[PDB]
Design a protein around this ligand. Sequence first.
Ligand SMILES: [Zn+2]
Ligand SMILES: [Zn+2]
Lengths: 230, 230
Amino acid sequence: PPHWGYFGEEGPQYWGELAPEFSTCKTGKNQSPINLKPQTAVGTTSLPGFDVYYRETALKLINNGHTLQVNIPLGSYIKINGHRYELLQYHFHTPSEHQRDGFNYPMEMHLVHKDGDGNLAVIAILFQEGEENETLAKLMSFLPQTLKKQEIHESVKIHPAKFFPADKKFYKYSGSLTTPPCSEGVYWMVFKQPIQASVTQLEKMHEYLGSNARPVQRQNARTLLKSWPD
Amino acid sequence: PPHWGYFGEEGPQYWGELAPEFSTCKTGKNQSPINLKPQTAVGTTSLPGFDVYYRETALKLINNGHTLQVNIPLGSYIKINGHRYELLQYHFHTPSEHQRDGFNYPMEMHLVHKDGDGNLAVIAILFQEGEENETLAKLMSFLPQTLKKQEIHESVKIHPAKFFPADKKFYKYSGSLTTPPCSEGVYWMVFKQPIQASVTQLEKMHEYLGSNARPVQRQNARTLLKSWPD
Ligand SMILES: [Zn+2]
Ligand SMILES: [Zn+2]
């Protein structure tokens, strides 16, 4: 499996050309992220919402070269209309990958879920500058200084739903992974409301991660849904 | 370009393996057709509707080996929310390709549109047994007995909008072509209400076409939309 990254010949424009297994990055018509345009988004009257069943667990953390990833032990899940997906992990992007009207946010966060058949559901949370984020602060104390370590902290418990915004409105669309092999068939939900982190918090995250965001992909035939009515 | 059909080693389960250009038939996550489940469909408050601008022209007709196709001259178009697609053709499938709650209809009809950038939008109309369809009856008088000719009739005019149901409600989703190369990125609208054709009409169409319907594909990460609210 070839090396890929966010700059140069390895960068996002060349992903689809790096190896046969990566080709969807270039040939897919339902890719993520997308530019989110609220004016263009379609209101709904019965879009399924989701129920969160996350349990408190020791912090397992890794800088895998492409992102900072928190690995979740089996036992946490969501239910989208009674359909159950297991929380596998969450990780971070600086700057954000999704845009609002063509503008990036300073940071984006992805909570990755999978069901029994291999189906993926992702919850995306956007950050903007503002109040210090206490939940983020717990995490940042333990940023790994080593690449590709797994770094366990038994006594640190962070509930991932602490990162959820107060407003529960979200956008939903059918998309893909934003990293190779860019697999499609991903159920995306993106919270409308960004949460806040401090400027110095956002800066340290960016300094740590570098720029690890994929450029926005064409919406094509897809409809962007709102979870509330117009 | 390799030969494909609807039975045997050339059949739909194998399309994706007949040639590299056909691989999306096998690897796609947003394929058509789908089983349409009215219970699962999500009502909307501001999904774009469409305006129909079709003009009356001589009947150009061809059996291309896989279907019966009526070719439309440049000048007919629809506008989806002010965005314009040109009508290229319409053609027929027996039995239907889309299902409702797992049941096929006797026949399905596809109006294919393409815009300037190559984006495709298909309007699908379902047939059920019932009244003799007069518009269908004109068309059947001129079924080509020759493969791959174009068979023009200057004096026969059929307005394609005659095939539209009285009820204008529809289901919409993001999908694909239902034939190789199974290109994705197709904007699908399927009328909720079937129109009627006589048992003898449907029977003769089926006998003419053979079985030319692709099996239903997994909905995966897609939401099925209704053009009206709950
Ligand atoms: Zn991500
Ligand atoms: Zn068709």
